[PDB]
Amino acid sequence: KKYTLLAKVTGLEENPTIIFDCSTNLPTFRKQQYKNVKKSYEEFHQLFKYLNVAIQESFVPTLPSAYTTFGINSEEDRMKVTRNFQLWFNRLSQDPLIIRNEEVAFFIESDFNTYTPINK
Numbered sequence: 001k002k003y004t005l006l007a008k009v010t011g012l013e014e015n016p017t018i019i020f021d022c023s024t025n026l027p028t029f030r031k032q033q034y035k036n037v038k039k040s041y042e043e044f045h046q047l048f049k050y051l052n053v054a055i056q057e058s059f060v061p062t063l064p065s066a067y068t069t070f071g072i073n074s075e076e077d078r079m080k081v082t083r084n085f086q087l088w089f090n091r092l093s094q095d096p097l098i099i100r101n102e103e104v105a106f107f108i109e110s111d112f113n114t115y116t117p118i119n120k
């Protein structure tokens with residue numbers, strides 16, 4: 001009965017890339033299954049910055065630390081950062097008012113490294 005947004009962070013690659021699959025039934029999306037979505041950290045910052053000021057009635061989860069995300073040096077670091085982005089996606093998906101915002105869809109569906117908000 002509920003709208004759902006399920007992200008599975010599958011890996012990472014200045015401006016690191018976060019790789020994830022996405023499953024949703026939200027009518028704001030073009031389709032339902034997305035595989036190997038690639039988003040740069042700066043695109044995440046753009047989405048957070050929009051949501052933080054656009055949805056002030058909700059708590060928008062703070063992004064994983066840029067310092068630790070940009071500072072990956074061990075495979076252990078890589079796993080910890082992967083888990084951090086997984087936790088971020090999980091908390092985002094748990095707010096039904098946030099996932100209804102079409103900027104979430106535009107972020108996920110736009111070309112790698114191109115997302116800035118459509119809405120002002």
